[PDB]
């Protein structure tokens, strides 16, 4: 019985490969040969945020590009003021093991989670209390790798149980579940329209999902190791992924295959985070070498390096307007580059 | 512009209050010590946690020794895969790797070799390179019982045991049968060989023969943490 299903799967995979192969008459790199080089890019640390006692894992830029979110193993969730450097809130967390955090688009709520397998939604707009817990989204069977808000009442979460789910904050029940990964799910990325989202896993592959239908649409297997990070291209028709392979790869949903590969001989370390500039021409990817590299999205050449961190760059974030680049590291120091 | 000055003064007062609270939390955090409990599924970690105490992904058990507080974390409902979440315990004071030394349908799997490979993988992990590990060789009574029974797995699954000789540095307690001491010291030497091959000096291991019912377990952890922090201080002042 199995042989009459595995063979069909192999035939379908071969058909998909043949269809993709016949579509590659010219690559992005070949036609982009006439594009003018970006040239060397230099950035300077404009701000440094201090106060965290332990290593920082994740951060999220606010919709106004003014406030920041930082999560550390010390149990403190601090809301920063990127312009004045002042700390607005410092929420003590019941569980010190938090691996991700998110700021709601309206700014009324904040979220975090980690090894506790529970996502806690914090309300910053309570009438008298400065901060309090609103709901605990229990139900996952593993550590929460990433989470992102869709609306004030809907949040998408990722866990190491090879499953992702959509949670209704008002009731706390899983409105939709996403399955298909054979390994842990590392990161999530919401599309500009928020209808679709793409998740990276340890399967050396990436998958695209629909929140309204909860079923996979496309599968990409260009990488060779775990996908640490994923981010959509600003137009929403393509995305880039960071993996332990030490090579970033660009994928287009319509081309349905890898377009560009970013790597060099001297770079052999894993990639922790990946982000896009507002125009999408420059790739900002964090590396275990304690520095970030700027890769040309089109020419696939390094434009600059953001060095100065004393420990692993755990996360990387770019404002909505793209005027500033915030980088987090295990040293507990947040550095803003511009 | 009073509307701006008032807001900036309120934001500075709030910042000062948050900074004072965070400073107090800093003393609280520095006073506290953190520990990680690891090991195989069938090991005695559960009984050790239970005796220390007298659906969630992690459990908390705090014990106080000599007025210094220790925090020990036990992994709860987590996927068997460990490579991606073990990295979160790089800053822990020490790792407690309780491994069962049982040497026996019943032999559903040989978890001694699996434990050795897991220890090697943890030892070679890039981000755990500065995290010392305390090695509790648990289940000594069962090891002795099986050695006396003449059906131990040590001789068959580890052919090098035939040429193995008891180290001169061994300090077996009086009344222990020579075969039991030889087997337990061979088990020790396996982990020491795995751990002593690095040579970088960023690691160290603390083997400890113990039983889950032993009350001295708590004191051993305190002594090992004391030694680890003392070595860290020696390193800081260039003494090492």
């Amino acid at each position: 019985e199995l042989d009459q299903l595995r063979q069909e799967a192999e035939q379908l995979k071969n058909q998909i490969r043949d269809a993709r192969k016949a579509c590659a008459d010219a690559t992005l790199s070949q036609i982009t040969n006439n594009i003018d080089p970006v040239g060397r890019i230099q950035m300077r640390t404009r701000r440094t945020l201090r106060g965290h006692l332990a290593k920082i894992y994740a951060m999220h830029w606010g919709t106004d590009s003014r406030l920041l979110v930082s999560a550390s193993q010390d149990g403190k969730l601090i809301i920063w003021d990127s312009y004045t450097t002042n700390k607005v809130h410092a929420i003590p967390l019941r569980s010190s093991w938090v691996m991700t955090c998110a700021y709601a688009p309206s700014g009324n709520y904040v979220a975090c989670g980690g090894l506790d397998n529970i996502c806690s939604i914090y309300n910053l707009k309570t009438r008298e209390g400065n901060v309090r817990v609103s709901r605990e989204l229990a139900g996952h069977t593993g550590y929460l790798s990433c989470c992102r808000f869709l609306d004030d009442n809907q949040i998408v979460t990722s866990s190491g149980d090879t499953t992702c789910a959509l949670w209704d904050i008002e009731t706390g029940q899983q409105t939709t579940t996403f399955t298909g990964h054979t390994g842990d799910v590392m990161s999530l990325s919401l599309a500009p329209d928020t209808r679709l989202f793409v998740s990276g896993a340890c399967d050396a592959s990436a998958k695209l999902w629909d929140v309204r239908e909860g079923m996979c649409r496309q599968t990409f297997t260009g990488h060779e190791s775990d996908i640490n990070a994923i981010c959509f291209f600003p137009n929403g028709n393509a995305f880039a992924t960071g993996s332990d392979d030490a090579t970033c790869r660009l994928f287009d949903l319509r081309a349905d295959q890898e377009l560009m590969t970013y790597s060099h001989d001297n770079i052999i370390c894993g990639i922790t985070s990946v982000s896009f500039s507002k125009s999408g021409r420059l790739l900002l990817a964090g590396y275990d070498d304690f520095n970030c590299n700027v890769w040309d999205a089109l020419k696939a050449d390094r434009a600059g390096v953001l060095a100065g961190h004393d420990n692993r760059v755990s996360c990387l974030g770019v404002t909505d307007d793209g005027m500033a680049v915030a980088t987090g590291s295990w040293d507990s120091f947040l550095k803003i580059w511009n | 512009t009073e509307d701006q000055r008032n807001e900036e003064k309120a934001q500075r007062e709030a910042n000062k209050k948050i900074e004072k609270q965070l400073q107090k939390d800093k003393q609280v955090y520095r006073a506290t010590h953190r520990l990680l409990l690891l090991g195989a599924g069938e090991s005695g970690k559960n009984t050790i946690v239970k005796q220390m105490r007298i659906t969630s992904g992690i459990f908390e058990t705090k014990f106080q020794v000599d007025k210094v507080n220790f925090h020990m974390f036990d992994v709860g409902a987590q996927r068997d895969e460990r490579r991606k979440w073990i990295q979160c315990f790089n800053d822990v004071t020490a790792i407690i790797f309780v491994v069962a030394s049982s040497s026996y349908e019943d032999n559903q799997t040989n978890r001694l070799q699996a434990a050795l490979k897991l220890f090697d993988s943890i030892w070679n992990n890039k981000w755990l390179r500065d995290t010392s590990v305390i090695l509790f060789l648990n289940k000594q009574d069962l090891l002795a019982e099986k050695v006396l029974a003449g059906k131990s797995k040590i001789e068959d699954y580890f052919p090098e045991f035939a040429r193995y000789t008891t180290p001169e540095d061994a300090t077996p307690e009086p009344g222990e049968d020579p075969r039991v001491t030889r087997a337990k010291y061979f088990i020790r030497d396996e982990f020491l060989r795995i751990s002593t091959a690095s040579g970088d000096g960023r690691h160290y291991c603390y083997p400890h023969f113990t039983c889950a019912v032993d009350t001295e377990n708590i004191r051993r952890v305190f002594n090992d943490c004391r030694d680890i922090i003392q070595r860290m201080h020696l390193r800081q002042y260039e003494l090492l």
Epitope: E224 | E81, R83
Partner: nanobody, 128 residues
Framework: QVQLQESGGGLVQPGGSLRLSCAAS????????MNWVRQAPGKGLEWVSD????????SYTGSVKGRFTISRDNAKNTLYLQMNSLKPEDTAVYYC?????????????????????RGQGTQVTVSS
Amino acid sequence: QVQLQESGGGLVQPGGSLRLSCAASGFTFSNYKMNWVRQAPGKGLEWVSDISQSGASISYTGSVKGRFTISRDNAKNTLYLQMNSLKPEDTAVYYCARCPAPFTRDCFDVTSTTYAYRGQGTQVTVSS
């Protein structure tokens, strides 16, 4: 895309010699440490042997030490497992395994649940 294809197997009498192969493809073979895994009927996964990047360092489990030989070829991009004097207890399905990251000495391919970087394996049986 990472793909592993184990080759060889069958039923042989105790003491027979069997040659297993792993035509590793779709990835830089030289950059990853390679290990062999097996699973006897009614029992969980167990590590068999491992080989380093260039093969300068090799190791075997005590129960199969000497009997089994692990070798790899970079020009052909294939891994071998030469079995000799097979005992009846050696019967098991053998998998070709690779640990996730390159340029690292620590592998994690003894996972019980589905593991992304191991092949489908081949059934090897030894009985009188």
